[PDB]
């Protein structure tokens, strides 16, 4: 139930030793991403925060494709990964919905964070953004979202 291997923590199920070297590589990158690399720019400081939301996403895509896509791990292992917080319970739960297949993170769909009642613009399909910028005669001005640096979560692209 915690992250720390406590005595109240339950020992791992069978298939965990096969996937443990993959999970440690995400784990040591999260230790190096939080390293307090002192960068004086605002554009670089949040860019380093964008690395953390990416690695938390990529660790959760991995456990997602193990269980729902390829069925490579048991349910008793998969529930143990959620209770030990190796995967995001609520983010995987959005990847099962139809429009939210390649979701950027849970924050980029919160309607209350934004000034409008809108999602983030990284939810918008790229071809829709190309069409609106084409009428204006300019290139599309969006590059990376301010919350976690996404470049498009829309399931069509």
């Amino acid at each position: 139930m915690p992250r720390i291997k406590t005595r109240r923590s339950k020992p791992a199920p069978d298939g965990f030793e096969k996937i443990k070297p993959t999970l440690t590589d995400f784990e040591i990158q999260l230790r190096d991403a939080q390293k307090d690399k002192s960068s004086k720019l605002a554009a670089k400081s949040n860019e380093q925060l964008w690395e953390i939301m990416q690695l938390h996403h990529q660790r959760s895509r991995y456990i997602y494709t193990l269980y729902y896509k390829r069925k490579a791990i048991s349910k008793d292992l998969y529930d143990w990964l959620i209770k030990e917080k190796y995967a995001d319970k609520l983010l995987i739960a959005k990847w099962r919905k139809t429009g939210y297949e390649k979701l950027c993170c849970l924050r980029c769909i919160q309607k209350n964070e934004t000034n409008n009642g809108s999602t983030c613009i990284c939810r918008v399909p790229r071809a829709q953004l190309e069409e609106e910028a084409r009428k204006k005669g300019t290139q599309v001005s969006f590059h990376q979202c301010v919350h976690c640096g996404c470049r498009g979560c829309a399931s069509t692209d």
Binding site: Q54, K102, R126, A127, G149, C150, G152, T156, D157
Partner: peptide, 23 residues
């Protein structure tokens, strides 16, 4: 846009996505 086109245009991205860059 067609599904074969959108399958092709998503392979233009340098990464796999969602952090793959159109630039």
């Amino acid at each position: 846009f067609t599904k074969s086109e959108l399958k092709r245009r998503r392979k233009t991205r340098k990464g796999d996505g969602p952090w793959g860059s159109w630039s």
